Assembly symmetry: D3
Homo-oligomer: 295 residues x 6
């Protein structure tokens, strides 16, 4: 026989996961973990299954960073260089995709008939959300805030929502948590959009993104077209970036955003309160996580 | 309430599938679904499950074109621009990853529990294949040709096998067709390597820096001449550099060496087919014509 | 004194007009001065003032080519390189702005006080035209075709009208020719849009990202397909992308739609001409041949 | 009728003037205004006409910045981003040209038979001056200082000279001021050339300009060709820029320049004195403006 | 000891001469060694020393191609890619400088003490030549044509003379051939200038910005037109710009002027040859055929 | 006669040497000079010949910088801009080559039958060393440390070795010094490789060089391929550069290097001691030069 099929080896696996291993060694904020833990105060998933869910969500989150950073044309990730800047675009892209499949083999280990539908519908919402955001970026067409919120619902829903639904599906109780979780994802994103601009310097302007405050500033005076024109230019320069910061303060767009985040956080606390009144323990950890996204 | 979640709309699906629909409408050889039918002479999968397997395999293949064209940095696909030169690399990449997911939602329609293990395990091979090839590319390390075929079995076999393993999961017959069908994916790829240089642009595997089959043979046949491998490093677009490499590769008798190997492999494919038939199987004309349309 | 001011010299004028002289010497259709004579059959402007109007219109037109070729980022002009690819974009732009001023010094020779209001008010239209077109380009916003013609009247009419309004200021006849002459500048532009794609490079309006007439029709005829408008975004130089768009634009029956519109417009131009003649005007052969050399 | 011609609208006008409005909102030095005002101590143009002259000169000056910055390939303008870096080259270029025409419609409002000839000959000198400067830049051919001074006479004459001549032509008195004004423009430019190099860092070297001190340094030792070669390179880098600063001090080119500016300022004060002796008030404001361009 | 020094190996020489071997194997006119033999009819250098002179001259010439192709930024050499587009500019440059040194080690085999003064003094001319040409290029300063020939004598004569001066150092005859042989290197270069434009790419001296002979004549024949010299500034690759310059250079009757000058120079070469022969020298057919193969 | 051959002129010579004159005016470390002087404590070359040797080695060293900086694609040289960044690549390249020939005319002045063979074999080793280093850089193939040391032996041998051999060949005594000198060159290079990374910021990573510590770090864990991938990217950015610094400390590669340099310096001091015991003066200056390359 001319062809003899060899076995996969630790060394080859080390190559394929090089960019994934790279990203997992940078220190980051434990966000996904704390949210899982604070919901487990209520769902009490068994330790063996909760570990599986926690591994799947860790893999999925990192592979998503490998691909987002490429699609968003990013420069830094958790303070260190973005992974395609070390390994090149192709290998980073392929490491992310390999990991999507590996996580599917992991979620098979729950042995739950409904698991794979939950995983599919979550990843469809993810891609759907990132899809609409790229469409607006690529066409210079500023969405409305309702439109943005629906998009981020799928984007920063997809993966929060996947974790909580895998948890719900492995737990005895039947309380529907995902409306709460979607609100928490939307808050988290609007807080991220703000911090990206007030804390590289304003990297969302480099990437051309119609983020939540950028939308308010563009719509609040459509006679002026300076900010939207800047987004088209995708500037690397700190003078243009600084100039747009200044224009966005002058439209009161950061006050507007702090304002919205207050309204949403109230809605979340009511939803949490209305849930404990129906026979769930008081959750401290979730109130704490909700203070952690604060401006 | 402040937030009111909306229903995904047909206009929005149109945007998400912009790149996918565009690639789908360019005409192609469609040699994947001819192979599938050729095998359905033996496994006799009912029509309503075959449509699903065809639909799933076609989706995955268009998806991996969207993505691999970005990865390999191609210029043309089926004589026309790569999707990302029209839609940009980000929307094209997301549309790819989108379709990978709709493919998984679709394979669930078989309602066969072996189906998910088969789908997952074949895509893992596809990535291992693509992964080792990019690795050899980016390190400027020429692999051996056993290493090359190992990689190619995973990569171009990965989704030939997906199609047949799914078919075997809907058939009751207890015969392993997979070794046959991998041998065929190798032949298909080695042909594609040869045809890339002697017949998607002038020699786009040179522009890509891909260590393809004849390039491998020509590099290793004389390692004291590093003209060929240094040309891969420069990823040339110039027709002058490409034509010189092609001429170097001729004087190494590499194109002959390739023609030679695919002939030994086609014989091995025929034997393998005749063995299957001598174990109570119909004589298969269509599979033999598939193997012959795979030639030069 | 330390500073002693010098006299501008013929060698220095040669440098300032380097780009202008270069463009002037490439042969052109010269359809502007044929239109001017065609109208002088009715208005009978004396020879010595007509030479000035011709000189002024020719200058302004070459000036706006120097400048608009930079703006639109063209590659060829009259089959030859754009002036700025030879002299650089700064000297070419200044030579343009220089000539705009010598044109104003020249229109003062008519010694007609209406002349300055006419000159200023037509250049303001030219800029409004060019301004709205660049705006639609740079925002990736497809205008409607009423919006398109409004823009085109200002832009390609702006300097047809300059030529005739100046002529009417030296004639005593009390007949408004301007509506006729704007209708003609529209036809001339819609022809130019069509000829840019079906006949200055292969489809340079695609490379420029210009929302031209048939491109507009093809984009709006099916807004669930964003292939065309995304191709404008990429400003392609590749012949492969340009040829695909051209092929997309065919299947929308846009080239037919254009041929159609210019036919309705040529009829409207003929009627308008015959009306003017039925009010005590000589029958004009030359204007009708101008309208026919404007066709496909 | 197939075609119906619409009217121009506030919105469309807002688009066309976007880059012009942008530049007018950045704070700058009130130079042109103060010079007009200090000459009005002598010419006493009527308020209604002086406002017209002041508007025309403001428009003309800003549109000239829109186009110079493009032609000079500039990065910053009054500390903020250059306008074609926000709006793109074409729209900025076209905004400048539209404004040249609008200002011509404005100078029509003086209703003066001689106004338009003054405006034409001023703008011809402007373009003539910038024309010769680009020619030297583009051909790597260092002019002589006499040649430079004639060029800047037209360049920074054209627009100073336009304002004072429009003023003279609207005033009762007949004293010829433009020889004084040309000297004041030359001083202003030589002072600008110095400050560009001693106060982005040395942007005249990025743009390849043969400025007044750069000329002295290149000619003072033509055996060395380092500085002229640097101009050909058009460097964005601060090491090359720093190196040329150092070479220019070693040829005593900044001392030479301070020297010239002293000689010229004397000539200006004598011209001002010789003018008051013939029956004009003592002008404080012009002596003050002349102290404002000091090194 | 910690450090143990190794012996240079044949595999390592192969890498160092990678670019040199590559250039050597492309076929060339080999007009240098035909000139050498033509002169050996008079000087009768023994075979074993002539082989060394040939070997040394061939090495230096290939070395200076490796290096000057980087300097001038060429695209093709002998119809094929420049070595640095394959090996990179650093290895190609080092291989050049390497061979310069092996050439010096080789000229030591003559064991002639005049040989080192001749070798050093001719390479110093080569650099002075290349140096003044780059200088005129990079300052955009057109030289005069006396300045041009002064430069060319150093540059293209520098290594014609090396070959003959070495030959005269092994012959006993007391006749100065060098003035003849420099005149011939000038003719060879002026031909090469003309053939670069009228016959290594379309007009690669335009793309390089080289002030070659006809370009010089055309620039200076009318200094109030700066189209030609501004085109040199842009170093155009576009065929459209190159073709326009070529057309400008025609209307200056520069190609005629060149044909003219090489005819006066060929006459001067013939006279010079006949004078040498009238001082007791064999009639030389081969040198006259060399001079005729140098023509258009 | 149509052609009249002119003479070379001071002015033309000034042009050709412009980039060479430029480099000689920047202040640098007197390394080559001090090593020559400290060996002359032993060889006592006559003043007239030692000056010739000292001129040849100065020329050769500077012309080598003109060409290395081009081949290594360098940005700074002795703190000031690299010479091809001022004069362009071609003129810098040609200035270096002209100077190689001029130095050959200089070494003719020793009038020594053996001089020119010494010069040839030294410059062959030079090119041979730089040749192998470019080969590894260009092929992403990490050498072994033995292989690196042989390469640097020829590279930083060639020119140290040329000076000492020209000296030996002009001196009465017959003690063979070049084994000592080769060790001193290897030390000097390993010290340079270290300082390039711990003192532009890490320019050896920009240039893709397999320097001594970079080799140890790549080989010490071939499972990880981050550092070698970075070399392929040739980064100008300080985040990637910083990230690789951090990875190299974590493999103890700088400790390893200090370690080696200690071992070699001992070997050198023994060689120096073993030489004085055979009837040579005690050399202070060479012990001092050996303390000057210290980490």
């Amino acid at each position: 026989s001319y062809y003899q099929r060899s076995d996969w080896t630790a060394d080859e696996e080390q190559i394929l996961l090089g960019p994934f291993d790279y990203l997992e060694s940078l220190p980051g904020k434990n966000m996904r973990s704390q949210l899982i833990q604070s919901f487990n105060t209520w769902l009490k998933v068994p330790t063996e299954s909760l570990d599986v869910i926690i591994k799947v969500i860790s893999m999925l989150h990192t592979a998503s960073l490998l691909i987002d950073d490429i699609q968003d044309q990013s420069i830094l990730r958790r303070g260190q260089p973005v992974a395609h800047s070390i390994f090149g675009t192709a290998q980073a892209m392929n490491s992310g995709n390999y990991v999507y499949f590996l996580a599917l083999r992991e979620v098979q280990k729950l042995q739950n008939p409904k698991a794979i539908s939950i995983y599919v519908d979550s990843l469809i919402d993810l891609a759907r959300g990132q899809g609409m955001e790229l469409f607006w970026r690529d066409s210079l067409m500023c969405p409305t805030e309702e439109q943005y919120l629906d998009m981020v619902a799928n984007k920063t829903g997809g993966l929060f929502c996947l974790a909580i639904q895998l948890m719900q599906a492995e737990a005895t109780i039947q309380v529907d948590f995902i409306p709460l979780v979607r609100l928490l994802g939307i808050i988290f994103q609007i807080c991220d959009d703000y911090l990206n601009l007030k804390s590289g310097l304003c990297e969302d302007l480099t990437e051309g993104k119609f983020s939540f405050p950028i939308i308010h500033s563009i719509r609040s005076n459509p006679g002026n077209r300076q900010l939207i024109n800047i987004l088209k230019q995708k500037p690397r320069e700190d003078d243009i970036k600084r100039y747009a910061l200044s224009y966005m303060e002058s439209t009161n767009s950061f006050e507007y955003t702090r304002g919205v985040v207050r309204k949403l956080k109230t809605e979340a606390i009511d939803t949490i309160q209305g849930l404990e009144k129906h026979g769930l323990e008081e959750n401290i950890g979730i109130r704490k996580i909700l203070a952690r996204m604060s401006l």
